[PDB]
Design a binder for this molecule. Structure first.
Ligand SMILES: CCCCC/C=C/C/C=C\CCCCCCCC(=O)O[C@H](COC(=O)CCCCCCCCCCCCCCC)COP(=O)([O-])OCC[N+](C)(C)C
Ligand SMILES: CCCCC/C=C/C/C=C\CCCCCCCC(=O)O[C@H](COC(=O)CCCCCCCCCCCCCCC)COP(=O)([O-])OCC[N+](C)(C)C
Ligand SMILES: CCCCC/C=C/C/C=C\CCCCCCCC(=O)O[C@H](COC(=O)CCCCCCCCCCCCCCC)COP(=O)([O-])OCC[N+](C)(C)C
Ligand SMILES: CCCCC/C=C/C/C=C\CCCCCCCC(=O)O[C@H](COC(=O)CCCCCCCCCCCCCCC)COP(=O)([O-])OCC[N+](C)(C)C
Ligand SMILES: CCCCC/C=C/C/C=C\CCCCCCCC(=O)O[C@H](COC(=O)CCCCCCCCCCCCCCC)COP(=O)([O-])OCC[N+](C)(C)C
Ligand SMILES: CCCCC/C=C/C/C=C\CCCCCCCC(=O)O[C@H](COC(=O)CCCCCCCCCCCCCCC)COP(=O)([O-])OCC[N+](C)(C)C
Ligand SMILES: CCCCC/C=C/C/C=C\CCCCCCCC(=O)O[C@H](COC(=O)CCCCCCCCCCCCCCC)COP(=O)([O-])OCC[N+](C)(C)C
Ligand SMILES: CCCCC/C=C/C/C=C\CCCCCCCC(=O)O[C@H](COC(=O)CCCCCCCCCCCCCCC)COP(=O)([O-])OCC[N+](C)(C)C
Ligand SMILES: CCCCC/C=C/C/C=C\CCCCCCCC(=O)O[C@H](COC(=O)CCCCCCCCCCCCCCC)COP(=O)([O-])OCC[N+](C)(C)C
Ligand SMILES: CCCCC/C=C/C/C=C\CCCCCCCC(=O)O[C@H](COC(=O)CCCCCCCCCCCCCCC)COP(=O)([O-])OCC[N+](C)(C)C
Ligand SMILES: CCCCC/C=C/C/C=C\CCCCCCCC(=O)O[C@H](COC(=O)CCCCCCCCCCCCCCC)COP(=O)([O-])OCC[N+](C)(C)C
Ligand SMILES: CCCCC/C=C/C/C=C\CCCCCCCC(=O)O[C@H](COC(=O)CCCCCCCCCCCCCCC)COP(=O)([O-])OCC[N+](C)(C)C
Lengths: 70, 70, 70, 70, 70, 70, 70, 70, 70, 70, 70, 70, 70, 70, 70, 70, 70, 70, 70, 70
């Protein structure tokens, strides 16, 4: 029948971390610039968004390190 | 006839904690990065997801310790 | 003819609390880790599942204490 | 007379996991987008529907692994 | 008799993603503007609704990528 | 019988973005002036309400641009 | 049955910008004089309250200019 | 059906960084001049708003540098 | 026998939107004043109740516009 | 004898989607306004009722599209 | 049998806006004085409570103006 | 023999809406006060119980209006 | 046989509003003091409990006023 | 049964504005003297507390003037 | 059988306002001292806890005054 | 033959409200303490269980008061 | 046959309040320390868990006091 | 079973005001010295921490004086 | 069958307070250092986390002291 | 199955305090230099960030000292 479940979860990871994910990064950075004007600028806001991109992209390396193999 | 029920429940554990489970870990980590941007960053959110992977993977060791044998 | 009913109910208890039951414990723990990610983490969920294993395994001791003999 | 029952149950599996099943997948994904707007967005809702497609499609591989042969 | 079930599920997908779906998108965007006034403005609310339209429209591409064929 | 669903959703959009919507805009602006007195004046409050009117009115153009056609 | 919703929202605007609104203006000005004594006098406080009256009264003209018609 | 999700997120980026974004820049600069009068002038306020425009515009270059490709 | 069902549903609409409905409006407004004291005052609470009266009264006009005739 | 069953089911459809159905629409809208006051206002409640009228009225067009002929 | 529902809702309005309501007003004013001491004094707190009494008492006039008759 | 069925159903209505019904009203109101303490206070709970008394008492007037005669 | 139902419902009202009800009032007040310490103090909490006692005790007067007789 | 709700709310007002309220006034004044030493002395702090006593005591006169009768 | 419910609710009041309640008072005061250090000191925090003890202890007198008898 | 049915129902009441019932009370109280930890603490949970013991024990007095004799 | 039901309910109470209950207390305290880190520290959380142990252990004394004998 | 709740709350008070509390006092004083350097020195900071120790230690005397007995 | 429930709850306590718990302590301390940079430094944050480790580790001593034996 | 939970928490500590942590230190120091210009320079800001690095790095030594072993 259909492909094994191991392949499908790989397709989601490839799609998320592909061209779609890269265009999500620029949208998050834009929200920082829009928020600093018409509001208040702080180090906590910029650190949170940039930290999110670091965790999101390259999450495969984080998963391998935490699990210990793969 | 079919194999004994003790073997079948072992197959589920091997499948869950195999390559399928490892690709589930990276999807959970990705959701952390996506959530920190376009939202709010907190220590509770990251601790819950990372704690979930610790409980999920290596649950055999937790079961043996709690039961006391095996 | 067949064995007395007292022996048969002992066989069910031995089978449930044998290797089959131990592999059921690790499946319950896995469901905790899967649920904490892709969702919400709470103390009620972990307490209920761990409390279930405590009641399930060693139910013979609970039955003897409640009845008062055996 | 008619074909053996082993063949008929194969026809149902082929029909479900054929073009009919693929068009069911896109309807489930559409319900996610419709639900996020005019309502609330959560990780539990998207995880449940996507997890359903993973279980539904490729269920033959899950059945073979659980049974242990085929 | 009637048409095969594969055709009917295609008609639902075409109707949902046709002119009816496009007019649903503008209603979701209107609810964002109405909610920001007479209330509170946040990045989470706008991200959820816009993310919903992305998932809803073009769900056929998401289904093909996840399944792996079609 | 009744008109097709494509027409009904158009009637809601016309009614919302008609004379009713224009009188909603002046009510949102009034709430800014009432809030600045008997309280605190900030750039975040005025930006949120004015941004809401921009998103609400002309949401058809935003929907067409995001979808890519219509 | 009842009057159309377009008429009701007009009644709120007329009531707010009528005699009730004019007596709200004098209360806001009084709070400036009370605050300057028993406290500190600054240009920011007076500018915010007077700016609020300018936005509140005549909000119909601001709405027409922003929307572009009416 | 509809276009792939990779195209839609590109349309948002083009719209934000297009003529709409440029007119947002002049509104942020105007708020600096309005704030310096009827208030206090400081280097922190001007630096925050100008820094916001730098982050907002050209966020694609920042995303490419951080990710490392594209 | 009895009157046709078309007449009965008209009687309910006339009764609801008659003197009984008008006295329901003043009770809803009273709950706003009682809630602002002994609690917290917000724009969301007042907007929801006033919006409810607008939808409730004059619902015949909303029904005619949505349906497209009558 | 009596008329053919094809005619009777047409009479039910005409009666439901006639003047009786139109007066049912205004009763559903009234319940929205009554519910927003003396309670909580949400986008899910209004979307469900308005979506119901869209499905109910013009169900003939939905049936023709799904079936594929008529 | 009992009196018509139009009379009962009038009795609630008379009771609320009678001697019971007047003694509720003095309790709300007392909470302002108690809160200013043992705490912080602000214009927002006093404006909210006094605004609540204005909305609560005389809600009949507000209902008549909004509805447009009675 | 016995009295006609029209008389018996009148006796039930008189008994329910007599002294027995009035003492039922005070029991329903008491449950509101008991529930607000040792729990949570909300407008939905009080509105439901008070609305129930309005429907219960004076149901004869509601029946006459709906039927259209009597 | 037994007493009429009108007498029994009077006995419940007398018992609830007797010495038993008065001792319930002091328990509700105690919960306010216990909650303010080891937690947060707010005007909403005290108003809800005190309002509950007002509704509970003297509910006979509220029932008579609403019904209009007795 | 119990006394009417109009009497109970009078008892709260008498208790608050009785000997209990007078001893609350001296505690508020003491906090001014304690705060001026071991800290900073300002006209805003003393004005707020003394203004609170003026609003708290004699709130009945303020309520009568605002309402317009009683 | 058992004692009347009037006696049981008296036992709870005696137990709460007995030696157990007095030792609860000292625990609440301790939390004030622990909170002032390792944090911030304010008049609102101390007033809330001390006010809680006043309401908790001697709640019988408050209940008698509010009810009007006992 | 056997004893009259009036005696048997007395034996059940004596047994339930005897030593067996008293040991049931302590089990209900234990469930409160177990539930507050590993979960959430609320006033509704404790009030329900304690209210249950009040109704259960001393139900003879409640039955006599309601019936009016015995 | 078996022992009387009065003895069995005593065995449950002894088992719960024995060594098993004492080890449950330390698990509840551990959850406080784990929750304060990787999250937020508050007085409500610690008070609820410690209050639970007080109610759980020594529930026999609470049952005797409430019942009035034993 | 376990000890009465009056004893347990005494154990907490003894533990807090024992050797553990004395070592908490020196940690609070250390934070004053660390804060004066690498920062600003003020009389408000030292007064708050020293006042906290006075309230914390000897809280039993404060509780006895406030309650009036023990 | 399985071991008694008293042994299992001991295994959880040993595992939590073993090498796993010690490595949890260093993760909590790391979060303090990460939070002070890219944000704000305060005494409340460090006190809460360090206080959590004190409660978590050595919870057996706290349980013994509170219970009074073991 | 997977590795024991003791190993996974070690991997997180090694990763955080590895090359990733060292590059986090230089980013925190950069924020000090950027903040001193375009703003105000103070000893509190530099002390907080440098103190954060001291706590973050070498947190294993702090954990061992506090716990007392390992
Ligand atoms: C599986 C391996 C995963 C590895 C994850 C590695 C993370 C290291 C990353 C990045 C550096 C920058 C990113 C965050 C910076 C936050 C600054 C900030 O400021 O936010 C902090 C949040 O504190 C953090 O989150 C810092 C914690 C970083 C990770 C903690 C240690 C590693 C994970 C251990 C947790 C549980 C272990 C599992 C147990 C079995 C709050 O401050 P705020 O004012 O912004 O609050 C915003 C609230 N409003 C909007 C209302 C103002
Ligand atoms: C069979 C052996 C099983 C062993 C399990 C071992 C677990 C130790 C693990 C990990 C460290 C990090 C993982 C969780 C961190 C939570 C932080 C947080 O923050 O979440 C806490 C939850 O509190 C916890 O869960 C911490 C408890 C950890 C385990 C408790 C003791 C061991 C189990 C005893 C229970 C019953 C015993 C059986 C009785 C017979 C809530 O805070 P929140 O703001 O996130 O709420 C989120 C809610 N929103 C989204 C609305 C904001
Ligand atoms: C489908 C196409 C849709 C296009 C939408 C275009 C929007 C651009 C518009 C406008 C300029 C002004 C309007 C908002 C200004 C906010 C200033 C402020 O201050 O609010 C900010 C909120 O941050 C924003 O929302 C700015 C974000 C603007 C849009 C973000 C990028 C575009 C959308 C991407 C999101 C997801 C993409 C989809 C992923 C597949 C918070 O600050 P606050 O202090 O007011 O917090 C108030 C809280 N209290 C009341 C407690 C203090
Ligand atoms: C709706 C119509 C309202 C009409 C209001 C008319 C006002 C004219 C009045 C009075 C003459 C004396 C009263 C103030 C004298 C201040 C002297 C002083 O010295 O204070 C000045 C404050 O500057 C002023 O406020 C003067 C401005 C007067 C009004 C400005 C123009 C009219 C309003 C335009 C604002 C926005 C327009 C709306 C935009 C749409 C600061 O100096 P300082 O050393 O005392 O700072 C004290 C700080 N420590 C304590 C730390 C040392
Ligand atoms: C049916 C006819 C009804 C007519 C109602 C007329 C109202 C005019 C009244 C009064 C003047 C003073 C009373 C409120 C003053 C607020 C000041 C304040 O400060 O509160 C503002 C709230 O903003 C307001 O509510 C002002 C809005 C006034 C009415 C708005 C326009 C009329 C209604 C349109 C809404 C929807 C229309 C229907 C659509 C179909 C927030 O500031 P905060 O710092 O206190 O936040 C407190 C939060 N903490 C405690 C955490 C700090
Ligand atoms: C058949 C024709 C029907 C026409 C209906 C027309 C409605 C326009 C009306 C009014 C202006 C003011 C009334 C609501 C203001 C809400 C402000 C607020 O604040 O509430 C918003 C709710 O968002 C809204 O509902 C705004 C949406 C307005 C209508 C949306 C577009 C039209 C209908 C499309 C839906 C589906 C289409 C059918 C698909 C086939 C939430 O914010 P919250 O903080 O109050 O949450 C309260 C929660 N707590 C209590 C916990 C804090
Ligand atoms: C129903 C009838 C009610 C009648 C109420 C009558 C009030 C007149 C009373 C008193 C004279 C002294 C008492 C307050 C003095 C404040 C000085 C101060 O300094 O505080 C001012 C607050 O501004 C005021 O509140 C003055 C306003 C006085 C009343 C306003 C006009 C009457 C009410 C209209 C409001 C809405 C109308 C209803 C709309 C339908 C702030 O300055 P701050 O530095 O202390 O800020 C402290 C903040 N930290 C601690 C961080 C530094
Ligand atoms: C048959 C005659 C019955 C007469 C009943 C008379 C009642 C007047 C009484 C009392 C003054 C104080 C008592 C409540 C104060 C609430 C303050 C508060 O704060 O609670 C408000 C609730 O809003 C109210 O309930 C005020 C409404 C008062 C009555 C409304 C008008 C009369 C009844 C009309 C309803 C339907 C009519 C029938 C239609 C046919 C919510 O705010 P919260 O933050 O506490 O939410 C707590 C939620 N957490 C815990 C999560 C934070
Ligand atoms: C049950 C019996 C309890 C007895 C309690 C006895 C207390 C007397 C004690 C001590 C002398 C020194 C300790 C505090 C010194 C504060 C100096 C300071 O400066 O702090 C004051 C705070 O004002 C106080 O708290 C002084 C009040 C002292 C007690 C008040 C009267 C007794 C209690 C009555 C309250 C309610 C009664 C119950 C009603 C039924 C604020 O100034 P700040 O610049 O530090 O603000 C810091 C804010 N930042 C960090 C942003 C700069
Ligand atoms: C049969 C005899 C039984 C005797 C029971 C004796 C109890 C006294 C005990 C202890 C002191 C500390 C323990 C609880 C402290 C709560 C603090 C807190 O904070 O929790 C309060 C809960 O309010 C309480 O439960 C205090 C009530 C204490 C007992 C009430 C009076 C006695 C019983 C009368 C009830 C019915 C009588 C029967 C009628 C016939 C809520 O606040 P939260 O922010 O934590 O909400 C948490 C919600 N989240 C997680 C979302 C933030
Ligand atoms: C488990 C073992 C852990 C050991 C931790 C050891 C820490 C010693 C370290 C370092 C020297 C420099 C680092 C901080 C310097 C702060 C200077 C500053 O200025 O900040 C101080 C903060 O006061 C501190 O935090 C100093 C306290 C240092 C530790 C306290 C004693 C040890 C821990 C005891 C706490 C609880 C014990 C557990 C109870 C069971 C505030 O002043 P600010 O103007 O910057 O406020 C900034 C606010 N704005 C941005 C608005 C202006
Ligand atoms: C990780 C290694 C980091 C190494 C950092 C090395 C720094 C040495 C650098 C530079 C020489 C010139 C740069 C600053 C000159 C300030 C002159 C001035 O005047 O400003 C001083 C500020 O006092 C300083 O900041 C001097 C301190 C320099 C460093 C302190 C010792 C090293 C770090 C120890 C701190 C905590 C240790 C960690 C604990 C575990 C204030 O005076 P102001 O009138 O300008 O106030 C301006 C206010 N208005 C605008 C209102 C007038």
């Amino acid at each position: 029948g259909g492909t094994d479940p191991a392949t499908m979860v790989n397709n989601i990871c490839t799609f998320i971390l592909g061209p779609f994910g890269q265009s999500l990064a620029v949208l998050g950075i834009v929200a920082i610039g829009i928020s600093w004007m018409f509001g208040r600028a702080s180090l906590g806001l910029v650190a949170g968004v940039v930290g999110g991109i670091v965790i999101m992209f390259g999450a495969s390396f984080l998963g391998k390190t935490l699990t210990g193999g793969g």
